[PDB]
Design a protein around this ligand. Structure first.
Ligand SMILES: [Ca+2]
Ligand SMILES: [Ca+2]
Ligand SMILES: [Ca+2]
Ligand SMILES: [Ca+2]
Ligand SMILES: [Zn+2]
Ligand SMILES: [Zn+2]
Lengths: 92, 91
């Protein structure tokens, strides 16, 4: 696989690692989301240590309002974090 | 770097690799988009050999309409391709 292809597969892999932990094996509940952010985004996102931060991050990404993050919502999440990182570094 | 953070940096890096070839250094034009898909998505998407295909792809992902693909547009393309890979290996 190319680097891009590997990146895509890694997105799908990290989602499933965290979503299959409890409940709907194909959705992130708040606790899986917090653990995904804490373990896998330590370098781009401030560690979450407060319930209200978990709550607000979910409220933000949850477009269909089932209180969980599904794959399509996770994709939007990756896009917002990636985009924020992209801009944070420009310009020079 | 976690494999997620690795994947994020790869997205930013592959985009600039292609967008900085020609014209605006921060957007993909059709030729840059074509070569991106042909070289970097060779295992996920059919090779682009026809002008009507690159045209359609750019039209499809250019949500603003500047005839080019910026980083935001590119991120939605990666989401579309990632979703299709996800479904392919399920069911
Ligand atoms: Ca779950
Ligand atoms: Ca949801
Ligand atoms: Ca360009
Ligand atoms: Ca555009
Ligand atoms: Zn799945
Ligand atoms: Zn840039």
């Amino acid at each position: 696989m190319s680097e891009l292809e590997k990146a895509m597969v890694a997105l799908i892999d990290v989602f499933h690692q965290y979503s299959g932990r409890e409940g709907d094996k194909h959705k992130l509940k708040k606790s899986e989301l917090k653990e995904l952010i804490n373990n896998e985004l330590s370098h781009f996102l401030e560690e979450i240590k407060e319930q209200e931060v978990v709550d607000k991050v979910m409220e933000t990404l949850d477009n269909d309002g089932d209180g969980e993050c599904d794959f399509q919502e996770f994709m939007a999440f990756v896009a917002m974090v990636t985009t924020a990182c992209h801009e944070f570094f420009e310009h020079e």
